[PDB]
Symmetry: C2
Subunit: 62 residues, 2 copies
């Protein structure tokens, strides 16, 4: 997990607000509550189990 300070979501156009990159699908995670895309690389605690990755809840919703 990259972010040691505050974590930022994605653009809505698909750009990570933190690292200024457009994450590929293998690096993208959308929340199960607000459905906001997040760059999984720039998270503080990326999901570590398969179930946590499926029903993933973003840091703003957790």
């Amino acid at each position: 997990g990259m972010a040691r300070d505050i974590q930022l979501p994605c653009d809505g156009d698909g750009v990570c607000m933190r690292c200024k990159s457009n994450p590929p699908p293998e690096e993208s995670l959308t929340c199960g509550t607000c459905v906001t895309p997040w760059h999984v690389s720039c998270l503080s605690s990326p999901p570590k189990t398969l179930a946590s990755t499926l029903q993933w809840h973003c840091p703003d919703c957790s």
Copy 2:
């Protein structure tokens, strides 16, 4: 050898159940849902889970 996906309604064609989101995995190429519980080899990394290719792909 007999890996079966989910129907349009959602009932898994290998266990006759409607899996929850914590047990549903949609393929990144043919956008077909699958029941991970009925999968022979579930994904092993985070990248293979985020962009998942179903057995038939």
